[PDB]
């Protein structure tokens, strides 16, 4: 007795065709209908299918809260209750409320069944259902005891959640896949369950399936196969073909058929493959195929699909139609492959607190089957690891030799490409310094010590001033002060200034420059030098406090998310953006920008960097549209070049107004007389964040300008007015005197009837509080307040020091993310810069930080590759050859670089060692889900072999990569040897107190010269962003987890 038949007595039962077992207490799908058979003696029960039905939501308050419940309801508003059969799946609804049950259990024929978290289809029999009982901890394990003191074993629901416990011991399984009655479930690090896919039974190779076996294990018989692994998109060559669904004939070498028509990874896929064919008229049948259908029926069904297929192949004398059917998209829907859970992003489990960008990451690992993509290293060696794209493994010796080789290329770009020596870069900027290994950072600085001797003297250090994207947390950097780091000014400004009226904290935070507890510099009484940490102050940058905020206007009146959009949508955004920026009340923009630039450009012990986007607007081309802040900013820069020097003394009086002041070259405190040049130097700033401020007639605000400035005339540089700020670049401006002491006394009245000299609250586009800058009258036409860096020898092993000489420098971040693409050669950014070389030198810019000049991948994966700023690149050696980059060609870059050298500036090469975008070539590697911190994530993806987009490069990487290494090892052999070093390490205190730094120790290995990364591959990467291929993309026998591989002694699936 096997199949559906009725016995001697009344009614009908069911028997497994395969085994012979009677179905009782189970679900089976026999031909058309789906049934349930009873616990009693298996007498059956019909579950009619529901075609046509609304599917919606209602409100129900049971007792506590009004919940909004989901319901099915048929066409006719009758809300369907109890167990129902819907599209050949079984979902369950509460018969009282009508609510859909998904991720839970239900009593049905004194038997508890479970429904998946997702769609809420019936997948398996659950063992026990517990609200009574409690947890226990025994032997360092976790377990669960019933109400009656005894243990629970196996798969049960504990307090509404699904969980599982070892059948022998009762140990709760955690962070592991496990099979229960052929169903694979995943249980998280906490222990809570989730269904994945029902596994097939896998039966004996019969008459028919004999001839669908693979012709041989050679490579020729298979295709679409990365590194010898079978993917879902693999076509194979059978031993024989069923010509026209009739004549079995030996297969020829030109014959191929798709693996997914004969083999499947789980029963889910197989059931969906059949019902898919039913839809597209390759299997005309009144039969219905569910997760409860007999394997025999499903496999027989799979053979009838081939019969019908082979007809259509015979007809069309080819198989391009099928390729199109299974693998390409149909009727604006995902393809058949992608529809499947095991072959899409849904089984990758994207997102999570730790997954900052592109929905998380995939940390590569090692595996016997994949000896090409295996790596001994892949250690992060820094606070963070993964950020974007394909994270490059910088712990690797060959990658460290390649990072030097690229450095040397950039540092000698002119000399290499065009034989032009004045066309080279001088300084660098390490992009994402906390995201790359310290070894290559250490080794990077060593190159700059070896090639330019920056440690020797501050004259040589200052000519090649480099900097990073980090605070004190970049330990390798701060240890010997090899580069500048970002001050806390930006943050400090963000609380006490950049917010709207009423949401601004007091300006006492701006007195000191502290990076979470540790002090960077204290402006209160800054009289000494060579003390503070070499740093750079900013308020905006290409990415910091802009992309966030610009995006804001883009999405409103446009809706496109900030990572991908059309040029039109961008242009429409920026319109509203700049249209808000010029207003008094600013939704998307920041307040008091000039006041903030005033601080940056007057504060001691910092090298401020100007942001292009604050002076010019991106609605127009490069240096095309001036911003509202332009005049204000140009004046302050001009003030700095001529006046700002000497010591600093900043305070906040009782009225709430910052009073920064500088005393001039030589003079370090308010009592110091100083040299004759001091008299016409040093300015005084007054700032305020109360636009509703109104001092009364008795109130007096003062600026003690110092003992050098007794009885001297002082003229305004910047003055707050009703409409904005009255700028002044010359002694032609309102003036005011100091008393016998040396003190500019102001008040709510005008100074000698000079309008706009009085102190008061004001609300206007360029300032929401008060801003006034004052310098001494009688400056020379060619005065300079800047101190020239000594050729003086340094023995203390520091590179950069904070002194007059360094504070004389002024960096310029000369690009934006949201520039439009030029329409002509003249409108391109690197030509414009070359034209306007003197315009920067006049403002007193010393360092000019260009945009990474690398060809963008233009894959619209992330913002950086949407708007093509140059951080998103494949060939990192291509700086605009042949076809231009956003900024220019390689000819235009060399023209720019020389234009800056001729205008006495240094040029910064922005170095991105972290990641690389869009590498077309494919490889198989073991990947596991991870977060920025290079940490394993507890996901149902687990650890799988994944086809990653890791092989690639470009024409110019082939050419240049690795080539200058043997050169370099000759000249500077110390770069290539091993080396011990020290670096700081930020510790976060658990008790909610301030962090603290501790000296850590490091040892970089030696590196090779001979080995060259001509192109990238898996083995030189730490990992890759989630690609969305799927958990089961590299195919494997999910019963036992054996991967398929093509060797002489292959592990073939068609078997
Ligand atoms: Ca990294």
TrEMBL record:
Domain of life, source organism: Bacteria
Domain annotation Glycoside hydrolase family 70 catalytic: ranges: 259-1054
Chain residues that bind Ca(2+): 385, 391, 435, 914
Function according to Swiss-Prot or TrEMBL: Production of extracellular glucans, that are thought to play a key role in the development of the dental plaque because of their ability to adhere to smooth surfaces and mediate the aggregation of bacterial cells and food debris.
Family statement: Belongs to the glycosyl hydrolase 70 family.
Official protein name in the record: dextransucrase
Organism: Leuconostoc mesenteroides
Lineage of the species this protein comes from: Bacteria, Bacillati, Bacillota, Bacilli, Lactobacillales
